[PDB]
Amino acid sequence: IIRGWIFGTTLDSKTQSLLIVNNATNVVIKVCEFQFCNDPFL
């Protein structure tokens, strides 16, 4: 049920954030300038 985490200071597109996730097939680590949802899920 627990899949990963997101780290940062502001979770909008104005700064960089780290995304660690393990979907059904792959674990993906990315450090990009994401725009995140209020309630992100899978």
Next chain:
Amino acid sequence: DGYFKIYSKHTPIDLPQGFSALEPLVDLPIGINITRFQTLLA
């Protein structure tokens, strides 16, 4: 110092008793600023 160090461990069987020490997993050179985090649930 711009690194993201992770220590993890798994153990077969409300926080339980015992003593188990986590071993190093990875140290990622992301070089960003972190002050918040959130969990992803499926």
Next chain:
Amino acid sequence: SKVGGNYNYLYRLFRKSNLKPFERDISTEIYQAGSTPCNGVEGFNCYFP
């Protein structure tokens, strides 16, 4: 170097606080330098970093 000037190399001139070791900052937000609000606009108080 090129004749007439090469403008492909940039650097940051304004920032609110000092960096930490091995920390990268690739933001592009306008810098406030007079305590007067400036939302994107520039001039007499605010500069492109």
